[PDB]
Structures are given as structure tokens and as C-alpha cells.
Amino acid sequence: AKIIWTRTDEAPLLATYSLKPVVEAFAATAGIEVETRDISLAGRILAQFPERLTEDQKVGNALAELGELAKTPEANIIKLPNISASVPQLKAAIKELQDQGYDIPELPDNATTDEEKDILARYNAVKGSAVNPVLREGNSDRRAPIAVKNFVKKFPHRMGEWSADSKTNVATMDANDFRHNEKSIILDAADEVQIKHIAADGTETILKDSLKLLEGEVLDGTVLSAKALDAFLLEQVARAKAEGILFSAHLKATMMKVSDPIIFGHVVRAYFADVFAQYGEQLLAAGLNGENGLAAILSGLESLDNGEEIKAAFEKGLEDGPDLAMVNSARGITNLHVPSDVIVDASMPAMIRTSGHMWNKDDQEQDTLAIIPDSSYAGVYQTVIEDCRKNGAFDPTTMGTVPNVGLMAQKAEEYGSHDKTFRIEADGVVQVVSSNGDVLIEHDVEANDIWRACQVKDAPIQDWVKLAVTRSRLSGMPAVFWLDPERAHDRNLASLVEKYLADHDTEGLDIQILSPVEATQLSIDRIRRGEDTISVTGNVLRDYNTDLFPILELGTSAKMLSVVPLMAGGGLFETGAGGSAPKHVQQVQEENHLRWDSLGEFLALAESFRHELNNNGNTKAGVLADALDKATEKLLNEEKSPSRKVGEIDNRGSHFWLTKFWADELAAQTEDADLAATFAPVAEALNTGAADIDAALLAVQGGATDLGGYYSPNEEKLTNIMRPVAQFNEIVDAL
Ligand SMILES: [Mg+2]
């Protein structure tokens, strides 16, 4: 079997030249090969223009090849952070590659010829998040790392004290929202449906022409009532003002790129009701409706004859209305300025951790009325708020853990509803018509309403249920499926879950189904008494829960174990969710100190070995994993992660110490005498030379360093820079 270690960009790329050689050496003792595959921005660019490269220049298509491997049982991929190219990065890499002799074309700013359109199309295939779509062939398994969990028990982050008088509460809709208006069905045969809009004029309008559906696929139809929404919003504005608490709105404008910016607009107009009551007609016509935030509005006023007048009306609105949660008080930026500034899954946990407070214009903590329009998930947060007001803040040193098994395969549910979300312009009805004419789903709609369709396939669902059983079985932690009895969609999934659980051996397992609210209560009841509960949820709750609990338990959701059980039985282990940190590379170029933290790679590697143990019966891989777990605990116990300052331990130094501790554990363990015998001399060697190696790894730091490039650094220079201590390299190479 072989593990594929992704060769990426910037910081993690540098770290890879130091860590991968060690991983390969250690993995080999369990009969595991470790190979790199190039998915760097530079490599993916070259992959698009093979016809422009000489035979020796061609790189093939590593990403495409990994996509294929991911569909086979042999897949064991460790995925490190990489660049999701912006136009500037793309342009910069193009130039560097050209300077290196790769005769690739310029990035067309505006395609004005057939050649440019073609070139642009190929470059667009490389821009942005091009990697994840290809590698994530499955559902999500995310857990708080126990090595991290154990550290936090020793050094707990700060949790804001909670008062039983807290006035903080989530405000959400009682009806007429996505949750209550949702209708869901399960196709019993493949079908190519269509979404129509029939007005009162009977005038039927086609919203979505062709939608291919598979047998067993779950399809939902729902609508958000603009009328009920505005009524709700105005009520909350008044309540926040009446109670003297901060008004805040928590949406996900970035991911839900269609529905949420629109809902954000309603929030803005609701807050500045008087302004739009006086200049509505004008403002909306000018496109200044708040869907781009208050900032977009204000800047657009300097384009109107009465801009200064309207601008004063807004300023009056801010002084008269309830105080707003602040994004940046120093710049007067409120919750309402930019739609994407406040993102629900990030903002709610922070507020809960901070005694249920957000910040006012005077940079002071204050209770808040947290508006979450749709009620599908608002109850989860509300349940935690009431619990904290009742029992106090959670205690990181004794609290249990709540992992997540999430349904996300093939843009499952809401995260794939973007091309099926429409802003209703006229009263009437929207219907999903079968290929034969039958009306599968139909909703009464009114101008300004938001109609949405979601879909999730059967295989993803069966795999999700299997993953839940697997995690409960392997961890011994009870699993709870979070399904809302009030949602047609969830009611459909509940029956499928009940059906598919029967395909598994669940004797001895504690598995059940509860509404998101009941599930949250049980989970936090147990967490407070130091017990654990796996949350098995849909896509959105997966996105919320993997932020919520890790932040409460660890103070951050940044250090997580992230696994994607691949379709064909293989595994994808993501080391981190951030970027490839360009500033870290800059520091290496400036003073040869890499502060990139490889903790995520250590964690993912241990799980990768366990994949081999549990799925390919590699017992030696489990021994390697157990020793690596202990080595990581010690690295953290001695605070040997990279320091941010030159002259102090950096990425290379952390690798050495992890390696030393790992060899020690392997030489000390008694499960495999052979492995013990193989590592005894390695540990011995690393130990006598530790003092010299550690000093040498501090000595190399200090001055300017030349990587021979940036997006396409020079192979020989990188190796020389990242593996500078011969004493260490020789111990590793000998293995
Ligand atoms: Mg999230």
C-alpha cells in the first residue's frame, strides 16, 4: 500500500521537503510506500498546456490522476493546505513559469478572440478552489484531536463567565420560513425534472429547465416568505431597542451566495425602515437595496443628487435604532456594513464563548439579540445559550467531546442549492414538474419570496450511515442523528437512516435519532459530565458543529482531525483548512525561519496509518500510529511547535523533535519486538546527537535565503535549505 503526500505551495511545500523524507523512512518499516504528487499552482498550470511544453517539460495531470485514485480502494491521500489562486497569484505564477522557460500564454483580462477564450477557459479551470472538488469524494469525519484535547486540559483557553441575568437570545422565525415551508420527496426512479413558475396570469415561467435526478435521490422544495420575514425583522429591531441589547444578524453570505445576500438586504431595510420609507423608490431603483450591505449603500449615495440628505437619514437611523453589534468600531463598521463580515458558524460560537456578548461602538461587551432568520438551525445555538445561562460556562479541562459525521458528498443539501434558488418576482406558484408532466412539488409564492430546491443522493446517504456506525464502533462513543421532526427533508432522511442501519451490525452500539434541539441538549448534558457524543448531521449542521464544539472545547476550530472516507473505500486526510501562508515563506526568504506549524500533518499522518490498520489489516501501521500519537503529545507538552521568532525553534526543529520522540516510543513499545529492534538504534542515534542537531537547526537561521523561485522554487535549493543538517539526514536515510 502507499500513502500519497500532496506536494503543494508556499509554507506547507517548504515543510514537506523536511518532513516527507522522515515520513517515508518510518512508513517503510510497516511496508508502506510514501510518494508525493504535485498539485501546486505551478504544476496545475503546466497541466493545462501540455501542447506548449517540450517533452522534458510535460508534467501530466497529477490532480486528475488523484481524482481517479480517490475512486479506488487503494486511495490513501494526505492533503496539505494549498493555493486557491486569485487572479494576481495566477498572473504571478504565469510570469515566473515563463521566466523559467515554460512557454505558456498570458492570462486574458478580457477574451476578445477564440484563442483567448480557450486560454481563459483553461486558466479558469485552475483558478480558485480547484482541488477540493476533485478530492472530496465522500462525507465528513471531523474530530477534536485528542493530543490537542489533552493539551487544552493542561492549558485551557479562556471562557467568558456567564450570568443567569443574561438577556442574550437567538431570534428566529416561527413560521413561513425554509423549515416550515419545506416539502421533500424521494424519487423511486431516475427522472429529469423542471422548475416552473405559474403566475396569476397562468403565465408559466421556466426557472430551471433541466435537472437530472437519480433513483433514491432526495429532493426538497421550500420558500421563505418575504412578508413574514420583514414582519419578523421589524419586530426584532424593536425588541433589541426595547431591551437595550445589541442588534445582530448571523447569516452565511459567502457560502449561500444567492439566498443570504438577499436576506441580508431585508435586514438592512428593516433596520433603516424610516429611510426606505422615505427614499425606498429611489434607493431600490439605484440598486442600493442593502443586499451588498450598508457600505455599498452609503458609497452609492455620493452618486445621487440628494445623497447628502439621504446620508443624514441613515446617520439618524443609527442613533435612533437599537445599538448594532460592531465589526470594527475604530472604522465605525457595524454588523450591517458588509454581508460577509459576520458569518453565523464563526460568530455564534465566539459570542457564546464570550459570555454571550458581542461588541458595541464603545468596544465594550454587551448582551445581544442574535437574529437568525430561518429556524432550521437557530435552535442549536439557542439551546447552548440557555444551557450556559443555567449552568455557567463550559470547563475545557473536564468537558467531553462532540465529533461530527457529516453528510456532504456531491454538494449535499443546501450547499448545492445555489443553481436552484430563485427570487420570486410575481405572485403565483412554483412547481417541480416530472418528466412525464406530474407535479412532484408545488408551492404558493409571492413577489420577493425566496424559493429554493435541494438535493442529496442515496449512495451518499448510505455511506453516511455506514460512517456513523463505524465511528461509534471504533470510538465506543454513542452516536446521535440530528434530524428535525418538523422538516419534510429530515423526516425523509430519518426513514432512510432507520432502513440503512439495518444493513449494519449495531449490537453493542448506542445509536439514536433526535431533533437538532434535543440532540444538542443531550450532547451538552453529557459534555458537562465529561462524556462524549458523536453528532451525525447534514451538510449545514456539519459546517456549524465543526466550529461550535471545537471552539468551546479547544478555543479554536483550526486544529482538527479532518477525514473524508472516500467512496471506493480509501481515505483522504486533510491536514488543515487554512491557506499556505505566504507571509511564512517571506520570513524564510528574509531570515531563514519557517514558523509554519506541522501539527496538522502529524495528526493526519497518525489517522492515515490507522486507515491502513483498520482497512488493510496493517498491524505494524497501528504500532506506528500509537507511537506517533505519543510523540505528538510530548512535542506539545514541551511546547516544541514552531516559534514565530528567528533564532528560536522553527518548523525544521519541530520535525526533528517529533522524529526523536517518535523513534523513542517505537523503541520503547512492546507490541512489536521487530519494530522495537529496528528503532532502538535510530532512537539511540537521535538521542546522542539531539543536542548538536538542535543547535545546528538554530544556527542556520538568521539571514536572507534564496529559494530560486516562489511558485516554482528550485528543487535543489529547497532540499538544501529544508534538510540542512547532515547528522540528522544520515540517521533518517539509514532507516
Ligand atoms: Mg463551519
Curated annotation (Swiss-Prot):
Its main location: cytoplasm. It catalyses: D-threo-isocitrate + NADP(+) = 2-oxoglutarate + CO2 + NADPH. Binds 1 Mg(2+) or Mn(2+) ion per subunit. Mn(2+) is the most effective cation in vitro. Mg(2+) can partially replace Mn(2+), resulting in approximately 40% of the maximal activity. Optimum pH is 7.5-8.1. NADP(+) binds at N82, S84, N132, G579, H584, R595, D597, R644. It comes from the Bacteria. Its EC number is 1.1.1.42. Pfam families: IDH. GO terms for biological process: glyoxylate cycle; tricarboxylic acid cycle. Catalyzes the oxidative decarboxylation of isocitrate to 2-oxoglutarate and carbon dioxide with the concomitant reduction of NADP(+). Cannot use NAD(+). This is Isocitrate dehydrogenase [NADP].
